[PDB]
Design a protein around this ligand. Structure first.
Ligand code: HEM
Ligand code: HEM
Ligand SMILES: C[C@H](O)[C@H](O)[C@H]1CNc2nc(N)[nH]c(=O)c2N1
Ligand SMILES: C[C@H](O)[C@H](O)[C@H]1CNc2nc(N)[nH]c(=O)c2N1
Ligand SMILES: CCSCC(=N)NCCC[C@H](N)C(=O)O
Ligand SMILES: CCSCC(=N)NCCC[C@H](N)C(=O)O
Ligand SMILES: [Zn+2]
Lengths: 407, 411
C-alpha cells in the first residue's frame, strides 16, 4: 500500500502514496500484465463531482470551508435538477492542468502548470469551432516560440449532441492509396483522408498535404474547413553536414496538437478538447519518418549515405536513424521552432518526477511510452522504475466518431 | 477467456489462451501496473499439487497423459513425498523441466532456441571442489572454441533450506570492480560488492580493468570456497572497429560466454538454487549496457572525444552517434574472431517469429516488453511494435536473495 520505485543508475528510491487515490482501472490483473497494450446517470455523476471539488478546494487550501460546502451543495442541486452541472472557470482551468499533470504517457509534464486554457464552452457551430481552432493554432505556434495550450468545447449532454474534432491532430498530412499499390503521403491518415474526400475535400494528392479540419458541433454532421496556410508553420529538413539531405524533399509541421481525445473533469466529458505542446525530436525523426508503416524512409537515407546494407550487423539502420534525427533537431533549431531532444526531455521528466514525489507523493508514468524509441538506456528514464495508474481529471481515448456518428 | 495482442506495424492480431495456465502473481493489480519494476522450506501439502501439475504437463508433452506410466509415476511421487517429504526428478523430467523454464522466461529474447538446451545433471555433486569441476566442464562445453552452445548445469535441489548449493557469482565469468580511495572505480562497478567478498575470502586481486573473477562456491550449505577458472577456458574478445583504428587503443575486451549463475530454477515444486545456464550475447548487452551505462564502464565520453563529435550540446546527438559506433565495434570484433553473437535486429526478428509460432502451437508466449525491446534503436526493431502479455508459468527461473545476505557462517 506504500510503494517504492528505484532508479538503478542513481540508487535513488522514491515512495509512492499517490496511487491510493487511483480511480480508474489499469487493464492489468495479478495474473497478467498488460503494460504494453496500446488500448487495454445522476447516480454516478455526483460522487464524481464531489471527488473533483474536494481536490480543488484542498488545492486552494479551503478544504471543508463554507465556500467548499456551498459549492458542493450548489452542484448537488444542479445535478438533481438539470442532471448535469457547469464548472466555474477556475475549476475548468484546474481540471485541464491536472488532466495533463495526470497524463502518464507524457514526458513533457514538467510544464504542466503553464498550460494556457481557452474556454470555448460558448461555441455552437462548426464555423465557431473553426475560429477557435485557428486562434489556438496561432497562439500556440507564436511564430516558432511555441506555447502549450488547450481549447475546450461544450461538454457532452445526452451524447446525441457531442462536439468532436474528427482529425487525430489539428495538423497532419494526407495519406492516399495508389493504383501503384504503394502509399503516397502519411499511411497513418489514409482512412481519415478517405472521410475528407468523400465529404467533399479536393485533395492535391501530394506527399505533404495538410489535411482540412473536419468539425462536428452539437452532434451535427461534421463540416470541412482548411486551416489558413499562413498559420501552419512547417520546417524543411536539412542535415548540417549532408548537403544531399535536402533532396529527399522532407518537411514536418511545428505544432503537435492532439485533437481526438476526451477530457474528463469531475465526471463531466469534453469530447472536443484539442491540446498542443511542442515536439521531442524522436517523435518525427524516429517514429514519423522511420516506422515501416509511416514514411519509412530508412532505406533511402541509408542508400544516400553509401552504407553496407547487405547485413543487419553493420548497424546501417541504426546509423541512418541517428543522422535523420540529427537533421530534424538541426532544422527546427535553425528555423527557431521550439523542439526538444530526447536527452533533454527525459532529464527534465526525471526532475519533474522527483518534484512530484516530494510535493504530491507520486507521479503516474507509463515506462513503455516515456522511454524514447531510440537510445533508450542512454536516457535516464530507462533506469527509472515507474508506477502506472489512472488519476482523474484525465485525458482518455475515445472511439473514432465515423464509427459512431449517425449521419 | 481469449486475450488478443496486436502488432501495430503489421496489424497481425494473436490470441492468448496460455495465460489461463498461469499460477504465480505479477505485482500488478487492476489499479496499478508494476510492469517496469525490476523485482516486484516447503510443506508436503503444498508440494504434491505442484508435483502433480508438473507431471500432468510432462506426461501431456510426451502424449502419455493418463497412461499407466503416468498414473504409476504420480503414485510413486506421492509416496516419496509422504515418506521423505520431498522427491527426486527423473532425468527426463529434469531435462524437460529446464527446457521449459527457458521457454517460460518472459524477459528472454533468445527463446527461439529453447528446445536445444544441453542439460548437465549435477545432482550427484557434494562438494565445492565438485561444483568447480562441473562448472569448468560447462564453460568448456558451452564455449566450444567460439561456436557457442546453450547449456545449463543443475546441482542438487533444496532440502531443508540449511543445505543449499549456491554459486555466489552472479555470472560464471564477469570482471572485478574495485572502489578506489578517491571514489573512482577500476573495472566493472556492478561487481564491486562481490569482488570485495572475494578479497575478504582471500582472492589475490590483480587490480586491473578486466580481471576475471574467481568462482565462489557453496555446496550442501557449507561456507563457500574460491576457485580460479583456468584462463585457457575463458574465451575473450579484444574490441576493435572496422574503420576506426584508434578504437583498439581504448583497451577494451569482453568475455564471449554469458552465463547467469545466481537464479533459482523451480520444477514441480522443487528448488534448484544453483543452476548456472548460458547462451550467447546479443551485441547491445555489451555495447549499450556493459560499456555505456553510467554505472558500468561508462565509455561514451572517451569515445565521442576520439570521434571529435560536437559535445557542447546534447542536441547534436553525440551520445547516440558514439553509441552506434561502439555497438558496430562489438559486433565486428566477435564476428572477426568467430565468436557467436547476434545483433539486435536479427535477434528481435527471430523472437517475433518464435512468438507467433508459440501462439499457434502453444496458445501463448509470455513476454516482458520492458526487457525484450533493445536498449538502443527500440522502434526500428519489430518488438517495439508488438503488444505482449506478461505472466508467470512454471517451470521457471526466479530471482533469489544474494547468498551473503542470508548465509549462516560456520567459520
Ligand atoms: C509542452 C511540451 C510537451 C512535450 C515536450 C510533450 C511530450 C510528449 C510525448 C513525446 C508524448 C508521446 C507522444 C507519442 O508517442 O505519440 C506525449 C504524449 C502525450 N501528452 Fe505530452 N507533451 C507536451 C505537452 C502536452 C500537453 C500541453 C498536454 C495536455 C494538455 C499533453 C498530454 C499528453 C497526452 C494525453 C499524451 C498521450 C497521447 C496519446 O496517448 O496519444 N502533452 N507527450
Ligand atoms: C541462446 C542464446 C540466448 C540469447 C541470445 C539470449 C538473450 C537474452 C537477453 C538479451 C537477455 C536480457 C539480459 C539482460 O538485460 O541482462 C536475456 C535474459 C534472460 N535469459 Fe536469455 N538468451 C539466451 C539463452 C538463454 C538460456 C540458455 C537461458 C536459460 C536456459 C536463458 C534465460 C534467460 C533468463 C531467465 C533471462 C532474464 C535474466 C534476468 O532476469 O536477469 N537465456 N536473454
Ligand atoms: C506495442 C507498444 O505498446 C507500442 O508500440 C508503443 C510502445 N511505446 C510507445 N511510446 C510512445 N511514446 N509512443 C508510441 O506510439 C508507443 N507505441
Ligand atoms: C527500471 C527498468 O525496468 C530497468 O532499467 C530495466 C529496463 N529494461 C531492461 N531490459 C533489459 N533487457 N535488461 C535490463 O537490465 C533492463 N533494465
Ligand atoms: C499534444 C500533446 S503531447 C505533445 C507532443 N510532443 N507530441 C504529441 C503527439 C505527436 C505525435 N507523436 C507526432 O509525432 O506527430
Ligand atoms: C545466460 C542466459 S541469457 C543469455 C544472454 N544473452 N544474456 C544473459 C545476461 C548477460 C548480461 N546482460 C551481460 O551483459 O553480461
Ligand atoms: Zn502491469
Amino acid at each position: 500500500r506504500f510503494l517504492k520505485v528505484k532508479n538503478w543508475e542513481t540508487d535513488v528510491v522514491l515512495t509512492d502514496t499517490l496511487h491510493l487515490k487511483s480511480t480508474l482501472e489499469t487493464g492489468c490483473t495479478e495474473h497478467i500484465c498488460m503494460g504494453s497494450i496500446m488500448l487495454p446517470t445522476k447516480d454516478q455523476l455526483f460522487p464524481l463531482a464531489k471527488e473533483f471539488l474536494d481536490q480543488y478546494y484542498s488545492s486552494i487550501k479551503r478544504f471543508g470551508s463554507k465556500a467548499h460546502m456551498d459549492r458542493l451543495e450548489e452542484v448537488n442541486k444542479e445535478i438533481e435538477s438539470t442532471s448535469t452541472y457547469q464548472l466555474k472557470d477556475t475549476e475548468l482551468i484546474y481540471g485541464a492542468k491536472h488532466a495533463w499533470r495526470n497524463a502518464s504517457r507524457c514526458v513533457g509534464r514538467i510544464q504542466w502548470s503553464k498550460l494556457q486554457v481557452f474556454d470555448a464552452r460558448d461555441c455552437t457551430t462548426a464555423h465557431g469551432m473553426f475560429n477557435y481552432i485557428c486562434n489556438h493554432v496561432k497562439y500556440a505556434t507564436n511564430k516558432g516560440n511555441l506555447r502549450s495550450a488547450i481549447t475546450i468545447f461544450p461538454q457532452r449532454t445526452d451524447g446525441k449532441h457531442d462536439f468532436r474534432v474528427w482529425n487525430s491532430q489539428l495538423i497532419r498530412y494526407a495519406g492516399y492509396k495508389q493504383p501503384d499499390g504503394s502509399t503516397l503521403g502519411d499511411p497513418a491518415n489514409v482512412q481519415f483522408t478517405e472521410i475528407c474526400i468523400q465529404q467533399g475535400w479536393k485533395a492535391p494528392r501530394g506527399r505533404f498535404d495538410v489535411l482540412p479540419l473536419l468539425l462536428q458541433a452539437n452532434g451535427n454532421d461534421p463540416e470541412l474547413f482548411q486551416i489558413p496556410p499562413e498559420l501552419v508553420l512547417e520546417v524543411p529538413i536539412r542535415h548540417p553536414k549532408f548537403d544531399w539531405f535536402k533532396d529527399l524533399g522532407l518537411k514536418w509541421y511545428g505544432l503537435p496538437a492532439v485533437s481526438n481525445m476526451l477530457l474528463e473533469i469531475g465526471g463531466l466529458e469534453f469530447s472536443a478538447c484539442p491540446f498542443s505542446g511542442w515536439y521531442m525530436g524522436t517523435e518525427i525523426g524516429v517514429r514519423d519518418y522511420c516506422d515501416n508503416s509511416r514514411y519509412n524512409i530508412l532505406e533511402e537515407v541509408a542508400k544516400k549515405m553509401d552504407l553496407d546494407m547487405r547485413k543487419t550487423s553493420s548497424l546501417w539502420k541504426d546509423q541512418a536513424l541517428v543522422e535523420i534525427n540529427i537533421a530534424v533537431l538541426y532544422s527546427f533549431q535553425s528555423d527557431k521552432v521550439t523542439i526538444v531532444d530526447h536527452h533533454s526531455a527525459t532529464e527534465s521528466f526525471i526532475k519533474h518526477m522527483e518534484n512530484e514525489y516530494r510535493c504530491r507523493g507520486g507521479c503516474p508514468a507509463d515506462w513503455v511510452w516515456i522511454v524514447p524509441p531510440m537510445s533508450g538506456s542512454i536516457t535516464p528514464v530507462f533506469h527509472q522504475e515507474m508506477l502506472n495508474y489512472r488519476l482523474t481529471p484525465s485525458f482518455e481515448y475515445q472511439p473514432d466518431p465515423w464509427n459512431t456518428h449517425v449521419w
